[PDB]
Design an enzyme around this catalytic site. Structure first.
Site, PDB file in Angstrom:
ATOM      1  N   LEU A 123       0.823  -1.198   0.000  1.00 50.15           N
ATOM      2  CA  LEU A 123       0.000   0.000   0.000  1.00 50.15           C
ATOM      3  C   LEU A 123       0.858   1.248   0.000  1.00 50.15           C
ATOM      4  CD1 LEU A 123      -2.781  -1.032   2.472  1.00 50.15           C
ATOM      5  CD2 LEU A 123      -2.886  -1.200   0.013  1.00 50.15           C
ATOM      6  N   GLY A 124       1.936   1.275   0.753  1.00 47.78           N
ATOM      7  CA  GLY A 124       2.777   2.448   0.735  1.00 47.78           C
ATOM      8  C   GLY A 124       3.975   2.228   1.610  1.00 47.78           C
ATOM      9  N   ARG A 125       4.789   3.258   1.640  1.00 43.58           N
ATOM     10  CA  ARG A 125       6.012   3.228   2.373  1.00 43.58           C
ATOM     11  C   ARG A 125       6.334   4.623   2.820  1.00 43.58           C
ATOM     12  NH1 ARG A 125      12.045   1.370   2.231  1.00 43.58           N
ATOM     13  NH2 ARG A 125      11.461  -0.791   1.624  1.00 43.58           N
TER      14      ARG A 125
ATOM     15  N   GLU B 271       6.691   0.189   6.166  1.00 39.11           N
ATOM     16  CA  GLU B 271       6.053  -0.154   4.908  1.00 39.11           C
ATOM     17  C   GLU B 271       4.752  -0.840   5.300  1.00 39.11           C
ATOM     18  OE1 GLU B 271       8.654  -2.838   2.820  1.00 39.11           O
ATOM     19  OE2 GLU B 271       8.114  -1.915   0.893  1.00 39.11           O
ATOM     20  N   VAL B 272       3.701  -0.539   4.528  1.00 41.10           N
ATOM     21  CA  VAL B 272       2.370  -1.008   4.807  1.00 41.10           C
ATOM     22  C   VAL B 272       1.900  -1.881   3.664  1.00 41.10           C
ATOM     23  CG1 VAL B 272       0.035  -0.265   5.327  1.00 41.10           C
ATOM     24  CG2 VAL B 272       1.971   1.000   6.224  1.00 41.10           C
TER      25      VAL B 272
ATOM     26  N   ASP C  65       0.294  14.254  13.869  1.00 42.00           N
ATOM     27  CA  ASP C  65       0.473  14.060  12.428  1.00 42.00           C
ATOM     28  C   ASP C  65      -0.894  13.984  11.750  1.00 42.00           C
ATOM     29  OD1 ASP C  65       1.930  13.887  10.039  1.00 42.00           O
ATOM     30  OD2 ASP C  65       2.259  11.733  10.251  1.00 42.00           O
TER      31      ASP C  65
HETATM   32  O1  LIG Z   1       0.741   3.761  10.255  1.00 41.39           O
HETATM   33  C1  LIG Z   1      -0.366   3.252  10.535  1.00 41.39           C
HETATM   34  O2  LIG Z   1      -0.854   3.110  11.693  1.00 41.39           O
HETATM   35  C2  LIG Z   1      -1.197   2.721   9.390  1.00 41.39           C
HETATM   36  C3  LIG Z   1      -2.419   2.145   9.645  1.00 41.39           C
HETATM   37  C4  LIG Z   1      -3.223   1.652   8.637  1.00 41.39           C
HETATM   38  C5  LIG Z   1      -2.933   1.911   7.294  1.00 41.39           C
HETATM   39  N1  LIG Z   1      -3.882   1.587   6.249  1.00 41.39           N
HETATM   40  C6  LIG Z   1      -3.942   1.984   4.944  1.00 41.39           C
HETATM   41  N2  LIG Z   1      -4.969   1.620   4.114  1.00 41.39           N
HETATM   42  C7  LIG Z   1      -4.688   2.070   2.807  1.00 41.39           C
HETATM   43  C8  LIG Z   1      -5.607   1.756   1.716  1.00 41.39           C
HETATM   44  C9  LIG Z   1      -5.694   2.541   0.557  1.00 41.39           C
HETATM   45  C10 LIG Z   1      -6.540   2.183  -0.488  1.00 41.39           C
HETATM   46  C11 LIG Z   1      -7.368   1.087  -0.323  1.00 41.39           C
HETATM   47 CL1  LIG Z   1      -8.462   0.659  -1.594  1.00 41.39          CL
HETATM   48  C12 LIG Z   1      -7.343   0.306   0.822  1.00 41.39           C
HETATM   49  C13 LIG Z   1      -6.455   0.654   1.835  1.00 41.39           C
HETATM   50  C14 LIG Z   1      -3.635   2.942   2.699  1.00 41.39           C
HETATM   51  S1  LIG Z   1      -2.819   3.118   4.202  1.00 41.39           S
HETATM   52  C15 LIG Z   1      -1.733   2.563   7.007  1.00 41.39           C
HETATM   53  C16 LIG Z   1      -0.878   2.916   8.055  1.00 41.39           C
HETATM   54  O3  LIG Z   1       0.271   3.597   7.781  1.00 41.39           O
END
Ligand SMILES: O=C(O)c1ccc(Nc2nc(-c3ccc(Cl)cc3)cs2)cc1O
EC number: 2.7.11.1
Length: 327
Positions: A40-42, A47-48, A151
């Site tokens: 999902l991201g970094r 990293e998630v 944040d």
């Molecule tokens: O640091 C944190 O506590 C943390 C907690 C949860 C988290 N959840 C995320 N969900 C997405 C997402 C985007 C698009 C779709 Cl379609 C589904 C999910 C992006 S980020 C990220 C975090 O960084």
């Protein structure tokens, strides 16, 4: 010096273990129960991934923590434990490790997020009221639990616009508030940093989050995202001062005995305080009401102690339509 108007002593009134995160000993479960499905991201600390728990088929998000002292890891974990069950706070399902490397990770509930850049151009008036109210519930909760998020920004506010679910995520910068404690000003995203951070005033409190929330409210009702778009931290304060006014900035600095970095002398200029109505035009007029502007004016204030608390904001007439629907 300065203190919070609400929840100032709440950590001092609790057991030390509540806030002494360096002493916390998490129970680390086994990451082998999770299958990573998609990145999902970094960011700098993690990293998630979207993942599935293979034992029960639950879809989750796994945040794998990048090397940092264990102190920051214990902080985030203890904060999340303390926030367990909090309204609209992302649910921490488990704290796990790769059982060989011992790298830690946090497992969170899944939210089917709508990308905020897309979302914030299609919100209705009622939608903005609703989502701001939901976000305020999370901030009032964490502040009542003695925690500053530090944040608050659109990415960190997951919104499933189909199910109308909102979660405040990424507690990795969050701290415990203790009266008179001096905190690091290197928190928040540039566009959401309060003036206190930008002028190096360390004795800040929960009200920092209320500035950030105000910035989000402005971006939503006015359709300018981010609302204050600085090029760097210095320019960020200039952008604020061009709206809130320079004489007014100086009054804030004087009140709190704040020393201004002399690089600002060359760039702040001279600016009158602007009327919030100046931001209204045909593209946003349907999102702006007297109530919205009154609320915004009471959030986007230099003087952190003069900003509404999350509770006071929830109690504002702008949210009456939301309360009426939820009752
Ligand atoms: O640091 C944190 O506590 C943390 C907690 C949860 C988290 N959840 C995320 N969900 C997405 C997402 C985007 C698009 C779709 Cl379609 C589904 C999910 C992006 S980020 C990220 C975090 O960084």
């Amino acid at each position: 010096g300065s203190r919070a108007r609400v929840y100032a002593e709440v950590n001092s009134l609790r057991s030390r273990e509540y806030w002494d995160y360096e002493a916390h000993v998490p129970s680390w479960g086994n990451q082998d129960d999770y299958q990573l499905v998609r990145k999902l991201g970094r960011g700098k600390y993690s990293e998630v991934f979207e993942a599935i728990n293979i034992t029960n088929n639950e879809r989750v998000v796994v945040k794998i923590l990048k090397p940092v002292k264990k102190k920051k890891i214990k902080r985030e974990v203890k904060i999340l434990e303390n926030l367990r069950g909090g309204t609209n706070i992302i649910k921490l399902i488990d704290t796990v490790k790769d059982p060989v490397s011992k790298t830690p990770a946090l497992v969170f509930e899944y939210i089917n997020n709508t990308d905020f850049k897309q979302l914030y151009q299609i919100l209705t008036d009622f939608d903005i009221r609703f989502y701001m109210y939901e976000l305020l519930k999370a901030l009032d909760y964490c502040h009542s639990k003695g925690i500053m998020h530090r944040d608050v920004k659109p990415h960190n506010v997951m919104i499933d616009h189909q199910q109308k679910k909102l979660r405040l995520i990424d507690w990795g910068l969050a701290e415990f508030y203790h009266p008179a404690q001096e905190y690091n000003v290197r928190v928040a995203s540039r566009y959401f940093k309060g003036p206190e951070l930008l002028v190096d005033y360390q004795m800040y409190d929960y009200s920092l989050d209320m500035w950030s929330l105000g910035c989000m409210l402005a971006s939503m009702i006015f359709r300018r995202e981010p609302f204050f778009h600085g090029q760097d931290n210095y320019d960020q304060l200039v952008r604020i001062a061009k709206v809130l006014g320079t004489e007014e900035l100086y009054g804030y600095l004087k009140k709190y005995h704040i020393d201004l970095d002399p690089h600002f002398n060359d760039i702040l200029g001279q600016h009158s305080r602007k009327r919030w109505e100046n931001f209204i035009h045909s593209e946003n007029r349907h999102l702006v009401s007297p109530e919205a502007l009154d609320l915004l004016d009471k959030l986007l204030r230099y003087d952190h102690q003069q900003r509404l608390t999350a509770k006071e904001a929830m109690e504002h007439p702008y949210f009456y339509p939301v309360v009426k629907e939820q009752s």
